[PDB]
């Protein structure tokens, strides 16, 4: 009787529990009946349910006893070089399809190779998969899972049927979160669940983690908006107004002061970029100033995605918006 975190306790065991990804779920439910399952390429943002969907499909297709004989799951936590593709994957694809389900349910006549996190594979190891996928297609199937489809080569893009996992909408995510909170005997207000589905941004894993952590923090009592704002790392609007007032002042000393105060408070630069972007696109600035400022915001977000320093990028963005705000003064 050990406790388990809610991201794994509420993982979809079957394909009916996967939310909002209606096209790929419908394809896999047709393949459960006996339709010809093609090669799959799942791609999309994190937390949308790419791994859970194919694991639920494999569990529905093969059952418990045939998962070790029909599914080869390789991810980036193990070595996937050119020799792993040439030896291990090809010898798995060349195996016979034997073993039947003992519970009387039908079993498909193919194997499944789940090459999860196919971004990290090299171009040579991806090029070695091509005739393995084409030649052994009678007895095995392939499911490449990635976050960026540009890092997978165009022959493997052509060989697989591409499914893009959209970010979950607020209706489906709110319904799933309310079902999880109902099954866990915890109460969450409407403002709390609205701020939760605003914060999580289509990441259902982040939403389940925030809901579990808010349940553990409050002890099982009512979850308000304040605990969601506390645990979500959302910068208060007073800091954003102070940053914009420092930019409207036109003095770089106050700009350095507010940047150092935001850095010393440990706020993430991505959250600051998101909140500054919302303030910039939702005010009465001119179109040219908004244009330049949003272009600098996109460049700063790209630089932070490449592991640049937070303080220098934030002071460059703040200098740009200070120049734009003091140009019209």
């Amino acid at each position: 009787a050990k406790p388990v975190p809610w991201v794994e306790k509420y993982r979809p065991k079957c394909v009916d529990e996967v939310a909002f990804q209606e096209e790929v779920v419908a394809v896999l439910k047709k393949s459960l009946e006996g339709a010809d399952l093609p090669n799959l390429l799942f791609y999309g943002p994190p937390g949308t349910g790419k791994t859970s969907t194919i694991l639920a499909a494999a569990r529905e297709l093969f059952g418990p006893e045939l998962f070790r004989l029909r599914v080869l799951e390789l991810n980036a936590s193990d070595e996937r070089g050119i020799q792993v593709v040439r030896e291990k994957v090809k010898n798995f694809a060349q195996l016979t399809v034997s073993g039947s389900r003992s519970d009387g349910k039908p079993c498909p006549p193919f194997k499944i190779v789940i090459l999860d996190e196919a971004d990290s594979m090299t171009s040579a190891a991806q090029a070695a998969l091509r005739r393995t996928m084409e030649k052994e297609s009678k007895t095995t199937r392939f499911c490449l899972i990635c976050n960026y489809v540009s890092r997978i080569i165009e022959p493997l893009t052509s060989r697989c049927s591409k499914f893009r996992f959209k970010p979950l909408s607020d209706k489906i995510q709110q319904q799933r979160l309310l079902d999880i909170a109902k099954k866990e005997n915890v109460k969450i207000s409407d403002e709390g669940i609205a701020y939760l589905v605003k914060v999580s941004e289509g990441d259902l894993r982040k939403a389940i983690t925030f809901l579990q952590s808010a349940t553990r923090l409050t002890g099982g009592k009512e979850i308000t908006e304040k605990v969601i704002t506390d645990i979500a790392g959302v910068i208060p609007a007073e800091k954003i107004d102070g940053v914009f007032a420092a930019c409207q002042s036109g003095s770089f000393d106050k700009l350095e002061a507010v940047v150092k105060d935001l850095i010393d408070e440990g706020h993430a630069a991505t959250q600051l970029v998101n909140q500054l972007h919302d303030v910039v696109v939702e005010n009465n600035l001119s179109d040219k100033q908004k244009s330049i400022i949003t272009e600098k915001l996109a460049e700063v977000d790209k630089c932070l995605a490449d592991g640049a320093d937070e303080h220098l990028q934030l002071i460059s963005l703040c200098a740009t918006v200070m120049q734009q705000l003091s140009q019209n003064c």
Partner: protein
């Protein structure tokens, strides 16, 4: 009999008459085969155009099923093709006679761009020395990764992209052999989204038929997730006709409503940016900004900021285009 196969492998052109597009190249190869004048071939082109299918149909036409394992040596990127293989099994296959029936042998080297330059340099005198005994077919997607010495020895055929006028009857044959209800706009959307590729047109057809049961324009654009032409025209009209806030709200509502991705929006807006009679200074700025936005989407970057920058690249040039007059 019925088999559980993907439609890109269930429906493969086993003969040269089942391929659609490259009629002059296939006629020349058929006349090479019928006159027994088959040279070393170099098939190059974009993926999904039917090069491996062409050489497999030629190998099945040349050799019978009782002797196919001794006359054809097919090696690809899943096999080890180092210089010890060129000096080993390939040279011994090229330099020896046949076992069962007298004839010329065939060494198919699929994905020849994946071979190392040492192997490609070792292949030159193997190709030239045993021209009478064996024939070589190099197939690649990128011709630059094949050395010019091997490009000189093999006559090259460009298997270019499949035109959508010739892609339609093969798709109609696949549809009539699978009992699929498809409309004219569904076939048009299939041959538009394929873009000279019959793998992606079969995959999309099978995925749409499994997801929805019918193949129309809306079902194809919903299963693929690609935006429609009207959505791209609306996005361009909003980015060129109104201010930043209203265009941002309308494009954000359109993306949240239909679940669109910014990569496909960027591709279709790039296609629209050349049809619109922009000034040449405006077009350079728009292409540079859109290329930068496409490059920023390849990493862990928030897509909302990149959507705002995509709007910003046109809101910069609105007053420039208007005051140009």
């Amino acid at each position: 009999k019925i088999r559980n196969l993907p439609w890109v492998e269930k429906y493969r052109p086993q003969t040269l008459n089942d391929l659609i597009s490259h009629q002059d190249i296939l006629s020349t190869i058929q006349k090479f085969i019928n006159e027994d004048r088959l040279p070393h071939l170099l098939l190059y082109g974009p993926p999904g155009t039917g090069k491996t299918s062409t050489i497999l149909a030629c190998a099945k036409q040349l050799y019978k099923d009782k002797e196919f394992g001794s006359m054809v040596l097919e090696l690809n990127a899943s096999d080890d093709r180092g210089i010890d293989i060129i000096r080993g099994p390939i040279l011994s296959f090229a330099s020896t006679r046949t076992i069962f029936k007298k004839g010329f042998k065939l060494v198919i080297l699929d994905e020849a761009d994946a071979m190392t330059q040492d192997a490609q340099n070792a292949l030159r005198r193997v190709i030239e020395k045993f021209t009478e005994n064996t024939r070589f077919c190099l197939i690649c997607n990128y011709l630059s990764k094949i050395i010019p010495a091997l490009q000189s020895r093999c006559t090259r055929f460009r298997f270019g992209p499949l035109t959508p006028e010739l892609m339609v009857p093969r798709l109609e044959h696949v549809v009539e052999e699978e009992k699929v209800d498809i409309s004219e706009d569904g076939m048009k959307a299939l041959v538009t989204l394929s873009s000279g590729d019959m793998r992606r047109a079969l995959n999309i057809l099978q995925s749409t038929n499994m997801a929805f049961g019918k193949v129309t324009e809306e079902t194809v654009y919903t299963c693929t997730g690609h935006p429609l032409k009207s959505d791209i025209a609306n996005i361009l009209d909003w980015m060129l006709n109104q201010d930043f806030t209203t265009a941002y709200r309308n494009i954000t509502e359109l993306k949240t409503l239909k679940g669109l991705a910014l990569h496909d929006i960027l591709t279709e807006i790039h296609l629209f940016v050349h049809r619109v009679d922009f000034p040449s200074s405006v077009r350079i700025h728009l292409l540079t900004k859109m290329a930068d936005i496409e490059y920023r989407l390849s990493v862990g970057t928030n897509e909302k900021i990149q959507l705002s920058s995509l709007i910003a690249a046109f809101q910069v040039t609105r007053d420039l285009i208007v005051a140009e007059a």
